[PDB]
Amino acid sequence: REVMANLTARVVGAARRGTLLEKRETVKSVALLVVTPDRGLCGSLVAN
Amino acid sequence: AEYFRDEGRDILLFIDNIFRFVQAGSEVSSLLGRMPSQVGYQPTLGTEMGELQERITSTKRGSITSMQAVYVPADDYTDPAPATVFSHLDATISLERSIAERAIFPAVDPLASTSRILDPNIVGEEHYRVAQEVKRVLQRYKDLKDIIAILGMEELSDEDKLTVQRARKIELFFSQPFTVAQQFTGRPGKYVPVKKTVESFARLLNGEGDHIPESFFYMQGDFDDVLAAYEASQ
């Protein structure tokens, strides 16, 4: 994390940051990673 | 009442605590020296009940619309007196203490209450379907009482959760203020026609009113009153 902090403090170039660090303006497609317990009895978490 | 029935006049007959009739027979038999049967009751319980009840019949000369009350000793529905009454009725309405202790003052248990005229030819197809669905719901609820009691609401499936929510809403909605209950309850009495009741329960079963909290179904008339209360609460 502090490695991210230091490196991003530099290489601020948008073209340089075009790799992943770039913010897509259109945001036409999005993706959600959902991590859900595998077995139930968990309570209200699986649903929440 | 038989004189008025025999001349053709329709009779509304209201007997109170047919049980008390049976309990007295029991005391009379005990003093008469008869051999006791079951829990101290008279040996001639069935015959006495028959002799009294078979006179409460609508004949071809006139009709008697009879409404009776029966007191269950303690809370035992297997007592010989109610068990003997049960076979002498066209419509049975079972009031349970557990429902009453939930402030549901009508206190009628839908699953333990039946009627012979609940027939699509007699009462109507829509009424019959609504009643059968209102029993199938709350039967799914009675089947899941222990799972909700121990594990909780979460373990049920989505459709099971929906049926349980609708069942509890239906339990609250069966409650209804009475005009004669103003003495100890501040709710004004409500008279819901059978058509309004059927329409309200059909709308509740369809899904309308799902968003409404259950507390708004308590002491209400038809579904329009519940919707108006919800709008008042915004």
**A46 residue type, one letter:** V
Phi first, then psi: give them for residue B46, nearest 5 degrees: -65, -40
Buried b vs exposed e over B46-60: b needs ≥16 C-beta within 10 Å?
eebbeeebeebeeee
Question: Distance (Å, rounded) from C-alpha B185 to C-alpha B162?
Answer: 32
Indicate the angle between helix axes B125-143 and B194-206, nearest 10 degrees.
50
| Distance of residue B185 Cα from the nearest chain A Cα, in angstroms | 38
Please tell me which residue of chain B has the smallest CA distance to A43: B154
Which residues of chain B come before a gap where C and the next N are over 2.5 Å apart?
none
Which residue of B lies nearest to A46 if distances are taken between CA atoms?
Answer: B154
Distance CA B31, CA B74 (A): 23
Q: Minimal Cα–Cα distance from A43 to chain B, Å?
A: 6
End-to-end CA distance of chain B: 53
Pairwise CB contact (< 8 Å): A47 & B155:
no
Cβ contact, residue pair A47, B154, below 8 Å: yes
Instruction: Decide if A13 touches B, using CB distance below 8 A.
Output: no
Distances in Å between the Cα of B167 and the Cα atoms of A40, B36, B44, B144, B161 are 24, 44, 43, 11, 10
Q: What is the DSSP letter of B36?
A: P
Q: DSSP 3-state assignment of A15?
A: coil
Q: Which residues of A touch B155 (CB under 8 A)?
A: 40-41
How many angstroms separate the CA of residue B154 from the nearest CA in chain A? 6
Pair of tokens at residue B194 = 């059978």
Number of H helices, E strands in chain A: 1, 0
* Dist CA B150 CA B123 (whole Å): 40
Q: How far apart are CA B212 and CA B229, in angstroms?
A: 10
Taking the CA of residue A39 as centre, how many other CA atoms within 13 Å lie in the half-sphere pointing to its CB? 1
Which residue is it, tokens 């009741």? B197
The residue to which tokens 């919707």 are assigned: B227
Pairwise CA distance, residues B93 & B224, whole Å: 26
A38: closest CA of chain B, how far (Å): 14
In this structure, are residues B75 and B97 in contact, taking their beta carbons and an 8 Å threshold? yes
Which chain B residue is nearest to residue A45, measuring alpha carbons?
B154
Name the nearest CA neighbour of B56 among B102, B17, B5.
Answer: B5
Closest-CA distance, A36 to chain B, in angstroms, reads: 15
Q: Contacts of residue A40 in chain B, CB cutoff 8 Å?
A: 155
Contact B138, B201 (CB under 8 A): no
* B154, B156, B157, B160, best to mutate vs chain A, most A CBs in 10 Å: B154
Tell whether A18 is within 8 A of chain B (Cβ).
Answer: no
Residue B101 to residue B64: CA distance in whole angstroms:
34
A48 Cβ under 8 Å from any chain B Cβ: no
CA distance linking residue B219 with residue B118, whole number of Å? 25
What is the DSSP code (8-state) at residue B72? P
- The technique by which this structure was obtained is cryo-EM
Query: Is A43 in the B-facing interface, judged by CB distances under 8 Å?
Result: yes
- CA B198 to centroid of chain Cα atoms: 16
Contacts of A47 (CB under 8 A, 6+ apart): B154
A45 touches chain B (CB under 8 A): no
Count of CB pairs separated by less than 8 Å, A with B = 8
Asked whether the beta carbons of B173 and B134 are under 8 A apart, the reply is no
Rounded CA separation B79/B41 (Å): 10
What is d(CA B203, CA B217) in angstroms, rounded to the nearest whole number?
13
Question: CA torsion B122→B127→B129→B133, rounded to 10°?
Answer: -130
